[PDB]
Swiss-Prot record, chain A:
PANTHER family: QUEUINE TRNA-RIBOSYLTRANSFERASE CATALYTIC SUBUNIT 1 (PTHR43530:SF1). It comes from Mus musculus. The modification Phosphoserine is found at residue 105. This is Queuine tRNA-ribosyltransferase catalytic subunit 1. Queuine binds at residues 77-81, 125, 165, 192. Disruption phenotype: Mice are viable and fertile but display cognitive defects, characterized by learning and memory deficits. Female mice are more severely affected than males. In the hippocampus, stalling of ribosomes on queuosine(34)-decoded codons is observed, as well as a global imbalance in translation elongation speed between codons that engage in weak and strong interactions with their cognate anticodons. It is a peripheral membrane protein.
Length: 366, 370
């Protein structure tokens, strides 16, 4: 067995919630952790110092540490889902410059990520937009994983994560879980569960994945940022998260709060001279009232997006810090009960999918 | 009784009023004519000091020390804060605070004190501006109020050797009123003069006539700063009328609409005709965006990752502004400014028949024939 990068610090006795820390080359990272998308923050005027002040110790990148001037950890994806036909050789596409046919193979994806110098790297996978081609992409993703592992020639400097496939197909994801688990990679990601319509199928697929992933290795759930989703998925055994949710929420003039969000473009805030949250210690809540942000959203929209994003990212980091603390304090079920009460009002008004999911791990709201 | 001058005239056009010079400012010289981008609008879009310095920018506008807050080694210009932040009396501007929400006052003395602490190299007086919808004798009262406010700014500004206070010419589109304001403010010894009240107007014909009126009465040995002007044709014509400094949100605003500034106008990159155009925005532009991004890539980003496309379009649009005025300035030094304008109008519009009538008349007033 290779050295493990995650140390389990505490567990919830009723549910699957875990509190740990990751040992990465650029410093330790407390888990559960939400990782903001670094470039989405940089393009809105958020600097390294601001992100460091909020306590962020890891974020996602498109070496790369110097290009961003970032002293902490970075996670980079393969680049497939962004950048067309796919064969067994790799992803075929037209370059965004020379305009000629290009190939991104599993070997090339690893070589690119090796040069960037990030601390966690993601395998190249084959994602499809129904028929029997979905199972073929899953088996190709397993073969691509082995080629990534062979091409990764620095396991002591960078950590390669596999990506579980299968979408919403319980039988397909079970096959992928059984096959990828046989490889000794430092961590595992859960793909194909972002932006789904059926919340009931969403949490059942998360529970299926965490029941078969190794306990001593991190579980990274991709594309999840909604507050209730984060709390429920921590109770199911997830350790790492990423989403553009804080960035996207700010583009619509909304600020994340314990009861949902504040739609600051509404006229009811034009004369509200309080902060977004009187208990939030983020810079935006020290200098900006709701009335000011409301005024900026109608004239100087670009400046309002900067301050809303600072707060929305801060909310994410504060949420999981509170989640992690409740696990350490051996009182995570009580945290969830208080969180659902504040967010929705009463057990009768909570979304059914979250009540059933939490009950699956023995956290009752009734 | 004249203070040392901050502008040195280097060359002039023999036919028109176009001037090429340099400003001696505490954080370095600045070649004029110069377009000054709004620094905060660029910072909020991910543009860094290093990127802006590489483009050759040596002066930009600040929100309103401030040099350290931006991490900027060159010069800064800050406004008074009036147009942003309600009733106005002789004491100052009365408004409700954004923080405590209580009544606050911005006086001429307080505006200077704020700008003194920011540490910028050029500072703007506080003026009393009324909407263009106001018509009667309240417009003339605001103009005379601005002159009295100017004297209070000068008295409250106790560091003419570290910061340069500019007056702001009032009057709007009223030829008689602006003549009074020009005649009155010229008697004050300020290092430079700005021209206010000419941004975003509908009537282009009255616009260029008001610019010419201002430059005919402002001192020759002092800079002329034209506020709120960034359109390419506007910049060239106003340089020919005697203006030295410009600022606008035009490059930043143009990027919010998915458009890239080019010598023939702009490219509307959200249109489907660019989805398979794998050439740069401009093959002759040396900006970073034109080194790394094709039109097809920017077209794709404008429909999925809009925030990233705004960053790269703004880098290019700012570079276009700086390149345009650098070329303008070079043609003046080369004693070939009329020929520059003729080629510029040819590329922009196509032929004399298709040029805007207001620009043909304005250029003809200073002896530039197309
Ligand atoms: Zn906040
Ligand atoms: Zn360019």
């Amino acid at each position: 067995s290779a050295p493990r990068i995650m140390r389990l610090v505490a567990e919830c006795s009723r549910s699957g919630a875990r509190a740990g820390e990751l040992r990465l080359p650029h410093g330790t990272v407390a888990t559960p952790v939400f990782m903001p998308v670094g470039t989405q923050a940089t393009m809105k005027g958020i600097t390294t110092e601001q992100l460091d002040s909020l306590g962020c110790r890891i974020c996602l990148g498109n070496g790369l540490h110097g290009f961003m001037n970032w002293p902490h950890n970075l996670l980079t994806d393969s680049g497939g889902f962004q950048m067309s036909e796919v064969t067994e050789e790799g992803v075929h596409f037209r370059s965004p410059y020379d305009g000629e046919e290009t190939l991104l193979s599993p070997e090339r994806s690893v070589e690119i990520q090796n040069a960037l110098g990030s601390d966690i790297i993601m395998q190249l996978d084959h994602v499809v937009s129904t028929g029997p081609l979905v199972e073929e992409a899953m088996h190709r993703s397993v073969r691509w994983l082995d080629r990534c592992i062979a091409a990764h020639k620095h396991p002591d400097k960078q950590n390669l994560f596999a990506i579980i496939q299968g979408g919403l197909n319980a039988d397909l994801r079970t096959t992928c879980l059984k096959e990828m688990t046989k490889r000794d990679v430092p961590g595992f990601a859960i793909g194909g569960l972002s932006g789904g319509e059926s919340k009931a199928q969403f949490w059942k697929m998360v529970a299926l994945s965490t029941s078969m992933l190794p306990k001593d290795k991190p579980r990274y759930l991709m594309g999840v940022g909604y507050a209730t989703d984060l709390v429920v998925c921590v109770a199911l055994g997830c350790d790492m998260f990423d989403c553009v949710y804080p960035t996207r929420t700010a583009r619509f003039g909304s600020a994340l709060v314990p009861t949902g969000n504040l739609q600051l473009k509404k006229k009811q805030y034009a004369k509200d001279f309080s902060p977004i949250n009187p208990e939030c210690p983020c810079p935006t809540c020290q200098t900006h009232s709701r009335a000011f942000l409301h005024a900026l959203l109608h004239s100087d929209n670009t400046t309002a997006l900067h301050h809303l994003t600072v707060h929305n990212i801060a909310y994410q980091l504060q949420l999981l810090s509170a989640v992690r603390s409740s696990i350490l304090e051996q009182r995570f079920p009580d945290f969830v009960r208080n969180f659902m009460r504040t967010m929705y009002g009463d057990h009768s008004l909570c979304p059914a999918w979250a009540v059933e999911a939490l009950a699956s791990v023995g956290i009752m709201l009734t």
